[PDB]
Design an enzyme around this catalytic site. Structure first.
Site, short mmCIF file in Angstrom:
data_model
loop_
_atom_site.label_atom_id
_atom_site.label_comp_id
_atom_site.label_asym_id
_atom_site.label_seq_id
_atom_site.Cartn_x
_atom_site.Cartn_y
_atom_site.Cartn_z
N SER A 1 14.97 100.33 35.25
CA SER A 1 14.41 101.42 34.39
C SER A 1 12.85 101.64 35.00
CB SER A 1 14.42 101.44 33.02
OG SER A 1 15.82 101.84 32.61
N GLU B 1 11.68 108.72 32.32
CA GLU B 1 12.25 107.65 32.97
C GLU B 1 12.89 108.22 34.23
OE1 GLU B 1 14.87 105.18 30.54
OE2 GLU B 1 15.88 104.32 32.31
#
Length: 201
Positions: free
Chosen positions: A128, A168
């Site tokens: 991530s 993200e």
């Protein structure tokens, strides 16, 4: 090379164009598993780092869905992403050794530089990252600046994330990245170790 730095409004417009194309390829169950990952990523990532596939079938089913979703998109442009973390990326032994209060331990930083600059790291969990260098990273001891090449697999998940605003970019598990440079940075109120790396795709 695109690098949005801290410009969240520019980053959001670019990422949404990538998501808009990705979303028509995604199944409803894939979308749901991406959302659930963003809601609580640690169980999946710990499982991948510590146990690996085969241990828990319900976990493996989730990982199969996310895996299948992330190969459905490809970056049109190369892009820089950011990830705050700690010393774990260097092995559990370096974690909690980096900091002496608000200053980076200079001897530890030198050893980490000598040991890991010019080496490849392999992340067993999903990776991530964010399109921007967000304020949340100021409180973390390691800042990774990662270049993702055009054609690479990375998905802009903010429109279905449990935490909208994180901007993200989610990269596949088992991502390999090469460390070009490690140095101490001193901006803000605490020093950090900055890692400049490239995804190999």
């Amino acid at each position: 090379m695109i690098d949005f730095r801290i410009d969240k409004e520019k980053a959001k417009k670019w990422g949404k164009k990538e998501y808009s194309k990705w979303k028509s390829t995604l199944t409803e169950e894939e979308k749901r598993q991406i959302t659930l990952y963003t809601r609580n990523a640690s169980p999946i990532n710990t499982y991948l780092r510590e146990e690996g596939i085969g241990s828990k079938p319900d976990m493996d089913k989730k990982i199969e869905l996310i895996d299948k979703a992330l190969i459905k998109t490809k970056l049109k442009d190369s892009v820089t992403v950011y990830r705050g973390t700690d010393g774990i990326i260097f092995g559990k032994e370096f974690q909690n050794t980096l900091m002496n209060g608000n200053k980076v331990n200079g001897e530890v930083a030198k050893k980490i530089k000598k040991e890991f600059e010019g080496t490849m790291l392999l992340e067993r969990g999903y990776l991530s990252t964010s399109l921007v260098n967000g304020t949340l990273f100021l409180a973390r001891p390691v800042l990774i600046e990662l270049k993702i090449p055009k054609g690479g697999n990375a998905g802009y998940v903010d429109p279905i994330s449990y935490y909208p605003g994180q901007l993200e970019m989610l990269l596949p598990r088992d991502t390999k990245y090469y460390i070009d440079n490690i140095k101490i940075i001193v901006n803000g109120g605490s020093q950090r170790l900055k890692v400049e790396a490239r995804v190999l795709s």
